[PDB]
Amino acid sequence: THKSEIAHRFKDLGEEHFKGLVLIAFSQYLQQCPFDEHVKLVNELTEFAKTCVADESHAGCEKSLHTLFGDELCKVASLRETYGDMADCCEKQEPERNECFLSHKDDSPDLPKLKPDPNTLCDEFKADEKKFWGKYLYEIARRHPYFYAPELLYYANKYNGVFQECCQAEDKGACLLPKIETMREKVLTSSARQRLRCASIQKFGERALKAWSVARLSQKFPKAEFVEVTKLVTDLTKVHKECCHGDLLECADDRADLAKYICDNQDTISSKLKECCDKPLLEKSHCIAEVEKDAIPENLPPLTADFAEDKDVCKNYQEAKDAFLGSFLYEYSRRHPEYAVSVLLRLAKEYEATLEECCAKDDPHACYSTVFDKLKHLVDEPQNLIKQNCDQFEKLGEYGFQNALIVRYTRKVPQVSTPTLVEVSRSLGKVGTRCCTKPESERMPCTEDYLSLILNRLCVLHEKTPVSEKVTKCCTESLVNRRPCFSALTPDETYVPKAFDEKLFTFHADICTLPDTEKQIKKQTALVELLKHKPKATEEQLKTVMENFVAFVDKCCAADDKEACFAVEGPKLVVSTQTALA
Ligand SMILES: COc1ccc2cc([C@H](C)C(=O)O)ccc2c1
Ligand SMILES: COc1ccc2cc([C@H](C)C(=O)O)ccc2c1
Ligand SMILES: COc1ccc2cc([C@H](C)C(=O)O)ccc2c1
């Protein structure tokens, strides 16, 4: 329909944005190459796009976006030498070649943890604002190779606006570190949301993403009609599909478009959008993404009416399954803005399973008329876990809770690799902080949605190199029952203990020197390995091993010759610990 896709997107996005997405795209496809390779790729591509803008007939201007990006990545001399089997993608035709690159996205790339000097940072910034802006896109995007790319350009500006307001202060440090931290959460979170949106389509079909889009949209805009929501849903699903499939130019473009549409139709969508719609382009879509719920309209009928009472349920459903089910989702979501999206989807799935068996039965209506009680039962099911988990969080504090979750997970999925068990248990206990201080009514929803983000990370880390059958099962059985499914696991008897490996339990003076985070991780790693070796260790003993350990580090980090003390106290500690675990 357009002579030249690259021309079209360049015009549409404008140079600056066009360059920032190309970079992000290269940086996600190729997470090792240094910055500088990438800025070369970015400009080559952009020069060429400029030629196509001026003359659309010009050779190459007709190629697809994959073919052009892909053409550019094959010309990397580093490929075979840096990326291994990656350079074999270059031997294929499109679209297999593109598929092949995308399958080498690495969810755990192992990159220097970003230690920033407020000084060096305000330097680099005053020297080159635009290169700074790019550098940040690169570093985030290479570490989060599914990160929502237009939402990333948004963060890059906010980053830049943080230094524009803070480098001209006197105590720059004190202005920066708060704002950086606050932003840097928001970015990890955004990444994990985005990774779960891609994990939907990839493992469960565009229909799962589409359904997410209904739940989210209906909650946010419950005034809007099904017909309208249905429109926004088609557009929102395409943005995310394109986005997850690495088509960032299309992603950005259709997203800007959808914001423009939403604004031009506030009267049929929401009363909360005034403030959003007066913002510039990137900020507009974010504000929208964050806008407040609209008020549930007034005389809505019972849901029982359309979905349980009505004798024609099986008729409407057989006629168009996903559409009818989208309607259930709109109707349920628009009335329960408090609920977790995971929950709404969990309800929709169950209502599906229900019609699925009931419409094949002799009087469907007797079977399905009773379904809402079953749904009431599901929403109430998880409430006691919360309580247990919050009390435990309050008693132990965040860090102790991370430890309890380390033990807990290591017993249920001890075949999981240790890096993954530590990362995930650390995130799981950050849920305590996120959700436990909230008013009770709010807790279950909060938790349900965070645990989905986090359990997805486990599934995604594990599916890379799969080792535990239970995890594979929970990860592939569903998205929306993962939390129940993980919560229903228990330690197992099949597991042979890991042979003692002393190397994993030695400590050196370095331990005193590490940044705090890295110090926690090193101990939580030991803790995991301990449970893999001693999977029956009881909680009182582990309390002993844990006090004894803190006494040990404390003694040794206080000593005149710390090495000597570690050398000596070290083996003492292995010995008691080996002794205490019978
Ligand atoms: C089909 O199941 C899903 C898909 C995507 C989800 C994304 C999210 C994040 C928290 C979101 O921003 O809504 C939560 C639950 C989800 C369930
Ligand atoms: C339009 O109705 C749907 C469609 C797809 C769904 C998928 C899922 C997830 C992926 C699942 O865990 O099976 C949940 C609910 C859904 C409702
Ligand atoms: C802050 O409240 C929480 C924190 C972590 C939790 C982890 C889990 C996992 C699924 C588990 O227990 O297996 C469940 C509930 C949780 C509630």
XYZ file of C-alpha atoms and ligand atoms in Angstrom:
633
model
C 0.000 0.000 0.000
C 2.966 2.474 0.571
C 5.806 2.372 -1.996
C 8.548 2.353 0.650
C 8.018 1.307 4.240
C 11.202 2.867 5.436
C 10.263 6.295 3.839
C 6.821 6.069 5.362
C 8.025 5.470 8.898
C 10.771 8.018 8.767
C 8.278 10.768 7.682
C 5.920 9.558 10.318
C 8.124 9.409 13.267
C 10.552 12.209 12.372
C 14.321 11.791 12.348
C 15.019 11.904 16.089
C 12.621 9.276 17.155
C 13.385 7.264 14.109
C 17.050 7.103 15.170
C 16.229 6.221 18.754
C 14.103 3.224 17.782
C 16.615 1.913 15.295
C 19.229 1.957 18.024
C 16.960 0.282 20.462
C 16.196 -2.302 17.797
C 19.859 -2.996 17.044
C 20.672 -3.023 20.680
C 18.075 -5.677 21.438
C 19.035 -7.902 18.483
C 22.740 -7.578 19.368
C 23.301 -7.201 23.055
C 27.051 -7.524 23.097
C 28.319 -5.034 20.442
C 29.620 -1.807 21.998
C 27.777 1.402 21.657
C 29.885 2.611 18.856
C 29.124 -0.173 16.352
C 25.576 0.581 16.929
C 25.664 4.312 16.228
C 27.266 3.375 12.880
C 24.560 0.968 11.985
C 22.036 3.601 13.109
C 23.363 6.343 10.848
C 23.932 4.108 7.789
C 20.365 3.053 7.979
C 19.187 6.618 8.574
C 21.169 8.016 5.584
C 19.601 5.478 3.376
C 16.167 6.280 4.747
C 16.805 9.910 3.862
C 17.506 8.824 0.279
C 14.274 6.923 0.150
C 12.403 9.899 1.499
C 13.616 11.990 -1.405
C 13.321 9.275 -4.118
C 11.088 6.286 -3.324
C 12.041 4.369 -6.523
C 15.575 4.314 -5.487
C 17.092 0.761 -5.260
C 16.401 -1.024 -1.915
C 13.755 1.472 -0.911
C 11.056 -1.229 -1.499
C 12.486 -3.773 0.869
C 10.724 -4.688 4.066
C 12.046 -3.332 7.385
C 13.355 -6.873 8.428
C 15.244 -7.187 5.189
C 16.913 -3.827 5.697
C 17.727 -4.244 9.421
C 18.754 -7.851 8.672
C 20.900 -6.719 5.782
C 22.727 -4.410 8.187
C 23.409 -6.995 10.860
C 25.006 -9.407 8.430
C 27.630 -6.837 7.587
C 28.962 -7.015 11.180
C 32.527 -8.497 11.243
C 32.003 -9.254 14.981
C 29.055 -11.655 14.360
C 30.615 -15.122 14.095
C 33.502 -14.124 16.457
C 31.232 -12.494 19.161
C 27.804 -14.132 18.625
C 28.563 -17.749 17.590
C 25.681 -19.596 15.805
C 24.078 -16.136 15.246
C 26.001 -15.569 11.991
C 24.147 -18.667 10.660
C 20.977 -16.558 10.663
C 22.632 -14.586 7.926
C 22.489 -17.641 5.662
C 18.754 -17.695 5.574
C 16.031 -15.954 3.598
C 13.455 -13.664 5.218
C 11.386 -14.182 7.289
C 13.386 -17.140 8.731
C 16.424 -14.946 9.044
C 14.533 -12.459 11.100
C 12.971 -15.216 13.241
C 16.392 -16.620 13.777
C 17.800 -13.335 15.101
C 14.831 -12.758 17.380
C 15.260 -16.256 18.844
C 18.701 -15.265 20.039
C 17.301 -12.516 22.306
C 18.764 -13.094 25.641
C 16.693 -12.495 28.734
C 19.709 -12.774 31.020
C 22.689 -11.157 29.175
C 25.145 -10.866 32.124
C 26.212 -7.214 31.802
C 28.202 -4.911 34.092
C 25.830 -3.676 36.796
C 25.480 0.046 36.068
C 27.632 1.837 38.692
C 27.076 5.598 37.955
C 29.333 8.550 39.229
C 27.089 11.619 39.589
C 30.183 13.633 38.617
C 31.189 11.662 35.504
C 27.513 11.549 34.571
C 26.952 15.320 34.683
C 30.188 15.596 32.675
C 29.213 13.196 29.890
C 25.838 14.987 29.859
C 27.040 18.594 29.450
C 29.574 17.350 26.832
C 26.986 15.469 24.712
C 23.315 15.639 25.537
C 22.192 13.700 22.538
C 24.839 11.002 22.869
C 23.875 10.655 26.524
C 20.265 10.226 25.562
C 21.358 7.502 23.191
C 23.728 5.829 25.594
C 20.960 5.256 28.048
C 18.593 3.803 25.396
C 21.422 1.449 24.519
C 22.215 0.255 27.987
C 18.623 -0.343 29.018
C 17.576 -1.832 25.748
C 20.458 -4.277 25.587
C 19.556 -5.535 29.107
C 15.832 -5.677 28.401
C 15.586 -6.960 24.925
C 11.791 -6.917 24.962
C 11.445 -3.603 26.590
C 8.494 -1.571 25.199
C 10.462 0.567 22.820
C 8.304 3.857 22.590
C 7.931 3.747 26.326
C 11.700 3.615 26.410
C 12.233 6.811 24.451
C 9.819 8.348 27.057
C 12.059 7.279 29.935
C 15.141 8.500 28.080
C 13.808 12.051 28.032
C 12.768 11.887 31.641
C 16.280 10.820 32.404
C 17.595 13.763 30.393
C 15.098 16.130 32.135
C 16.355 14.871 35.476
C 19.923 16.109 34.659
C 18.815 19.350 32.966
C 17.135 20.196 36.378
C 19.819 18.707 38.626
C 23.338 19.367 37.248
C 22.826 23.149 37.757
C 22.269 22.550 41.457
C 25.145 22.612 44.034
C 24.690 19.290 45.753
C 24.073 17.364 42.464
C 24.362 13.929 44.257
C 21.437 14.571 46.654
C 19.245 15.790 43.712
C 20.133 12.778 41.501
C 20.219 9.621 43.490
C 16.591 9.858 44.752
C 15.243 10.667 41.278
C 17.388 7.961 39.522
C 16.246 5.214 41.995
C 12.591 6.258 41.712
C 12.812 6.175 37.927
C 14.845 2.973 37.830
C 12.182 1.024 39.656
C 9.596 2.319 37.278
C 11.662 1.034 34.376
C 12.237 -2.468 35.737
C 8.576 -2.765 36.422
C 7.673 -1.503 32.973
C 10.024 -4.100 31.510
C 8.539 -6.990 33.388
C 4.962 -5.882 32.397
C 6.166 -5.752 28.772
C 7.839 -9.137 29.003
C 4.623 -10.706 30.140
C 2.709 -9.072 27.340
C 5.148 -10.712 24.924
C 5.094 -13.935 26.743
C 1.302 -14.057 26.178
C 1.450 -13.975 22.348
C 4.548 -16.140 22.005
C 3.290 -18.894 24.238
C -0.439 -18.465 24.175
C -1.510 -16.746 21.032
C -2.518 -13.336 20.009
C -5.851 -14.180 21.616
C -4.294 -14.014 25.068
C -2.838 -10.594 24.406
C -6.095 -9.386 22.897
C -7.923 -10.561 26.047
C -5.504 -8.726 28.251
C -6.241 -5.634 26.150
C -10.034 -5.962 26.865
C -9.524 -6.455 30.592
C -7.248 -3.514 30.912
C -9.187 -1.231 28.699
C -12.613 -1.997 30.149
C -11.442 -1.398 33.636
C -9.903 1.915 32.656
C -12.744 3.118 30.473
C -15.890 1.514 31.772
C -18.016 4.311 30.278
C -16.999 3.290 26.768
C -19.173 0.855 24.788
C -18.178 -2.667 23.714
C -18.060 -1.523 20.072
C -15.612 1.243 20.930
C -13.526 -0.825 23.348
C -13.412 -3.435 20.559
C -11.781 -0.784 18.344
C -9.182 0.274 20.922
C -8.455 -3.361 21.631
C -7.638 -4.127 17.963
C -5.337 -1.151 17.858
C -3.682 -1.864 21.253
C -3.091 -5.467 20.442
C -1.460 -4.597 17.193
C 0.925 -2.092 18.848
C 2.012 -4.794 21.279
C 2.152 -7.505 18.701
C 4.332 -5.442 16.487
C 6.331 -4.445 19.482
C 6.990 -7.878 20.784
C 7.896 -9.113 17.308
C 10.691 -6.516 17.117
C 8.874 -4.210 14.567
C 9.604 -1.073 16.557
C 8.949 1.480 13.829
C 5.476 0.094 13.337
C 5.093 -0.220 17.070
C 5.884 3.490 17.735
C 3.843 4.752 14.844
C 0.642 2.872 15.629
C 0.960 3.725 19.219
C 1.169 7.490 18.522
C -1.780 6.995 16.260
C -3.779 5.289 18.903
C -3.166 8.031 21.406
C -4.240 10.542 18.776
C -7.412 8.522 18.285
C -8.123 8.243 21.930
C -7.831 11.929 22.501
C -10.044 12.813 19.492
C -12.765 10.644 21.150
C -12.713 11.380 24.873
C -16.462 12.114 24.860
C -17.084 8.335 24.129
C -14.165 7.020 26.114
C -13.389 8.778 29.393
C -13.651 12.018 31.333
C -10.108 11.639 32.716
C -8.252 12.353 29.563
C -8.249 16.153 29.423
C -4.938 16.484 31.218
C -3.406 13.740 29.069
C -4.450 15.045 25.761
C -2.672 18.413 26.273
C 0.722 16.848 26.484
C 3.389 16.306 23.888
C 3.655 13.089 22.015
C 5.554 10.675 24.198
C 4.130 12.013 27.372
C 0.609 11.833 26.004
C 0.729 8.016 25.600
C 2.287 7.435 28.924
C -0.229 9.703 30.791
C -2.923 7.757 28.949
C -1.320 4.448 29.943
C -1.459 5.816 33.561
C -4.795 7.650 33.545
C -7.314 7.152 36.367
C -10.284 4.855 36.073
C -13.543 6.358 34.881
C -16.534 5.911 37.197
C -18.605 2.790 36.744
C -21.862 4.045 35.065
C -24.982 3.886 37.100
C -27.714 1.338 36.309
C -25.833 -1.637 35.012
C -27.880 -4.871 34.993
C -26.636 -8.060 36.709
C -24.049 -10.021 34.730
C -26.052 -13.080 35.538
C -28.459 -11.684 32.888
C -26.370 -11.909 29.814
C -24.155 -14.709 30.838
C -26.078 -17.057 33.026
C -29.796 -16.443 32.919
C -30.246 -16.026 29.134
C -31.236 -19.339 27.488
C -29.263 -18.502 24.341
C -25.785 -18.502 25.989
C -24.571 -21.523 23.948
C -25.955 -20.076 20.782
C -24.021 -16.708 21.133
C -20.860 -18.453 22.205
C -20.780 -21.130 19.496
C -21.506 -18.367 16.959
C -18.309 -16.380 17.892
C -16.313 -17.741 20.823
C -13.602 -15.194 21.384
C -15.959 -12.316 20.718
C -18.587 -13.496 23.162
C -15.808 -14.169 25.622
C -14.395 -10.680 25.020
C -17.852 -9.444 25.931
C -17.874 -11.366 29.156
C -14.491 -9.797 29.867
C -15.669 -6.280 29.089
C -18.800 -6.750 31.150
C -16.914 -8.239 34.117
C -14.026 -5.827 33.977
C -15.926 -2.639 33.610
C -17.645 -3.411 36.957
C -14.520 -4.536 38.902
C -11.772 -1.906 38.436
C -10.306 -2.993 41.778
C -9.510 -6.484 40.515
C -6.181 -7.753 39.232
C -6.090 -8.231 35.554
C -4.775 -11.769 36.187
C -7.856 -12.407 38.171
C -10.253 -11.088 35.553
C -8.554 -13.307 33.021
C -8.674 -16.193 35.373
C -12.427 -15.705 35.657
C -12.856 -15.427 31.861
C -10.927 -18.688 31.409
C -13.119 -20.498 33.842
C -16.295 -19.250 32.368
C -14.859 -20.605 29.102
C -14.052 -24.057 30.467
C -17.600 -23.964 31.834
C -19.475 -23.294 28.621
C -17.057 -25.667 26.893
C -18.355 -28.687 28.805
C -21.840 -27.411 29.520
C -22.850 -26.762 25.864
C -22.126 -30.445 25.127
C -24.521 -31.534 27.892
C -28.280 -32.186 27.743
C -29.704 -28.982 29.356
C -26.852 -26.491 29.200
C -28.864 -23.950 31.310
C -29.046 -26.180 34.463
C -25.309 -26.736 34.163
C -24.269 -23.047 33.542
C -26.911 -21.011 35.401
C -24.858 -21.817 38.596
C -21.513 -20.538 37.315
C -21.152 -17.226 39.086
C -20.991 -18.923 42.475
C -18.017 -20.879 41.173
C -16.528 -17.578 40.112
C -17.264 -16.028 43.522
C -15.424 -18.980 44.931
C -12.341 -18.269 42.780
C -11.960 -14.618 43.634
C -12.150 -15.526 47.368
C -9.739 -18.552 47.248
C -6.443 -16.755 47.570
C -7.196 -14.441 50.466
C -5.568 -16.544 53.257
C -2.162 -16.813 51.475
C -1.965 -13.074 51.528
C -2.511 -12.905 55.230
C 0.051 -15.629 55.878
C 2.598 -13.975 53.570
C 2.058 -10.427 54.904
C 2.459 -11.510 58.614
C 5.629 -13.254 57.689
C 6.830 -10.183 55.809
C 6.068 -7.913 58.799
C 7.744 -10.164 61.252
C 10.924 -10.695 59.160
C 11.349 -7.390 57.258
C 12.093 -7.403 53.510
C 15.482 -9.004 53.581
C 14.528 -11.818 56.061
C 11.449 -12.456 53.865
C 13.637 -12.796 50.770
C 15.393 -15.473 52.862
C 12.244 -17.305 53.766
C 11.245 -17.309 50.072
C 14.669 -18.525 49.128
C 14.207 -21.516 51.375
C 10.674 -21.990 50.280
C 11.378 -22.034 46.571
C 14.531 -24.006 46.862
C 12.637 -26.849 48.445
C 9.928 -26.874 45.787
C 12.113 -26.287 42.776
C 15.589 -27.279 43.752
C 16.566 -28.191 40.215
C 16.219 -24.530 39.249
C 19.633 -22.911 38.741
C 20.868 -20.930 41.733
C 21.201 -17.455 40.010
C 17.527 -17.780 39.099
C 16.380 -18.963 42.448
C 18.143 -15.964 44.096
C 16.954 -13.390 41.615
C 13.367 -14.533 41.805
C 13.119 -14.944 45.527
C 14.604 -11.455 45.896
C 11.851 -10.054 43.683
C 9.274 -12.154 45.390
C 10.008 -10.649 48.752
C 9.967 -7.150 47.279
C 6.267 -7.916 46.793
C 5.938 -7.730 50.564
C 6.956 -4.068 50.522
C 4.851 -3.302 47.447
C 1.689 -4.785 48.655
C 1.613 -5.375 52.405
C 1.380 -1.744 53.540
C -1.694 -1.218 51.312
C -5.255 -1.254 52.877
C -6.398 -4.827 53.214
C -9.034 -4.699 50.349
C -6.169 -3.708 48.037
C -3.682 -6.376 48.933
C -4.912 -9.404 46.948
C -5.149 -7.450 43.716
C -1.733 -5.895 44.164
C -0.073 -9.158 44.895
C -1.784 -11.157 42.217
C -0.489 -8.860 39.451
C 3.091 -8.577 40.827
C 3.449 -12.258 41.308
C 2.444 -12.657 37.653
C 5.171 -10.281 36.607
C 7.633 -12.149 38.758
C 6.576 -15.745 38.173
C 6.867 -14.822 34.415
C 10.502 -13.967 34.949
C 11.070 -17.394 36.482
C 9.287 -19.104 33.574
C 11.266 -17.070 31.081
C 14.647 -17.643 32.829
C 13.958 -21.246 33.168
C 12.680 -21.997 29.699
C 16.057 -20.822 28.386
C 17.859 -23.911 29.686
C 15.135 -26.173 31.138
C 15.979 -28.339 34.168
C 12.906 -28.637 36.388
C 9.797 -30.425 35.011
C 7.498 -28.784 37.553
C 8.418 -25.341 36.445
C 7.968 -26.256 32.841
C 4.527 -27.607 33.721
C 3.447 -24.442 35.609
C 4.894 -22.191 32.976
C 3.157 -23.909 30.028
C -0.176 -24.882 31.559
C -1.216 -21.313 31.819
C -0.388 -17.746 32.305
C -3.247 -16.935 34.577
C -3.068 -19.889 36.995
C 0.724 -19.778 37.465
C 0.439 -18.258 40.860
C -1.991 -20.976 42.192
C 0.105 -23.538 40.370
C 3.345 -22.432 41.980
C 1.656 -22.031 45.337
C 0.343 -25.503 45.144
C 3.820 -27.059 44.806
C 5.535 -28.783 47.711
C 9.013 -30.122 48.343
C 9.586 -33.507 46.596
C 11.122 -36.912 47.380
C 12.552 -37.575 43.887
C 15.257 -35.019 44.488
C 18.644 -36.557 45.363
C 20.627 -33.979 47.451
C 23.410 -32.084 45.820
C 26.861 -33.509 46.842
C 28.753 -31.235 49.197
C 30.883 -28.690 47.312
C 33.076 -26.756 49.670
C 34.005 -24.086 47.219
C 30.424 -22.825 47.383
C 30.730 -22.196 51.090
C 33.975 -20.394 51.422
C 34.166 -16.740 52.171
C 36.948 -14.314 51.730
C 37.546 -10.765 52.945
C 36.096 -9.437 49.746
C 32.782 -10.098 51.376
C 33.363 -7.009 53.526
C 33.941 -4.769 50.576
C 31.065 -5.566 48.203
C 28.313 -3.074 47.414
C 25.368 -3.947 49.744
C 23.194 -5.603 47.083
C 26.112 -7.751 45.911
C 26.778 -8.725 49.523
C 23.181 -9.896 49.954
C 23.283 -11.868 46.747
C 26.490 -13.596 47.733
C 24.904 -14.749 51.010
C 21.579 -15.627 49.472
C 23.462 -17.685 46.911
C 25.151 -19.666 49.734
C 21.784 -20.101 51.304
C 20.358 -21.614 48.127
C 23.244 -23.945 47.728
C 22.747 -24.974 51.344
C 19.185 -25.927 50.828
C 20.103 -27.898 47.614
C 22.546 -29.921 49.623
C 20.428 -30.153 52.755
C 16.887 -30.064 51.519
C 15.502 -31.277 54.786
C 17.274 -28.713 56.977
C 14.606 -27.515 59.465
C 13.815 -23.828 60.113
C 15.320 -23.692 63.688
C 18.562 -25.118 62.425
C 18.711 -22.691 59.556
C 18.146 -19.970 62.115
C 21.254 -21.292 63.928
C 23.284 -21.513 60.649
C 22.138 -17.942 59.886
C 23.018 -16.399 63.291
C 26.326 -18.294 63.314
C 27.104 -16.987 59.921
C 26.426 -13.304 60.802
C 28.526 -13.673 63.930
C 31.303 -15.040 61.669
C 31.287 -12.260 59.100
C 31.036 -9.708 61.817
C 33.951 -11.052 63.747
C 36.096 -11.334 60.652
C 35.231 -8.048 59.014
C 36.207 -6.465 62.384
C 39.587 -8.244 62.740
C 42.967 -6.586 62.187
C 43.940 -9.250 59.599
C 40.648 -10.196 57.944
C 42.012 -12.758 55.535
C 43.637 -14.676 58.464
C 40.415 -14.688 60.406
C 38.422 -15.891 57.355
C 41.016 -18.577 56.610
C 40.593 -19.794 60.146
C 36.973 -19.158 61.097
C 35.824 -20.308 57.718
C 36.407 -23.987 58.134
C 35.116 -23.862 61.731
C 31.842 -22.708 60.293
C 31.640 -25.462 57.697
C 32.306 -27.971 60.432
C 29.525 -26.828 62.760
C 27.206 -26.483 59.946
C 27.996 -29.911 58.657
C 27.592 -31.102 62.201
C 24.244 -29.449 62.853
C 22.600 -30.813 59.682
C 23.030 -34.338 61.088
C -3.247 -13.123 29.536
O -2.623 -12.976 30.774
C -1.966 -11.793 31.128
C -1.256 -11.086 30.124
C -0.557 -9.897 30.376
C -0.579 -9.401 31.689
C 0.142 -8.189 31.961
C 0.094 -7.729 33.285
C 0.705 -6.465 33.715
C 0.737 -6.458 35.201
C -0.207 -5.324 33.304
O 0.272 -4.160 33.115
O -1.467 -5.459 33.148
C -0.633 -8.432 34.253
C -1.327 -9.620 33.983
C -1.302 -10.115 32.691
C -2.000 -11.314 32.462
C -11.084 -13.915 24.911
O -11.051 -14.752 26.054
C -9.851 -15.234 26.555
C -8.881 -15.540 25.599
C -7.625 -16.016 25.941
C -7.290 -16.200 27.288
C -6.008 -16.702 27.579
C -5.630 -16.881 28.904
C -4.249 -17.363 29.345
C -3.160 -17.329 28.322
C -4.181 -18.692 30.008
O -3.621 -18.771 31.148
O -4.645 -19.692 29.403
C -6.569 -16.565 29.888
C -7.850 -16.086 29.601
C -8.234 -15.883 28.263
C -9.548 -15.390 27.924
C 3.569 -10.131 49.613
O 2.742 -11.261 49.648
C 3.238 -12.364 48.992
C 4.620 -12.384 48.640
C 5.141 -13.467 47.950
C 4.266 -14.526 47.622
C 4.767 -15.630 46.924
C 3.934 -16.670 46.564
C 4.472 -17.860 45.834
C 3.592 -18.071 44.658
C 4.315 -19.092 46.673
O 3.979 -18.992 47.891
O 4.468 -20.236 46.153
C 2.582 -16.636 46.928
C 2.079 -15.555 47.626
C 2.923 -14.484 47.976
C 2.362 -13.403 48.671
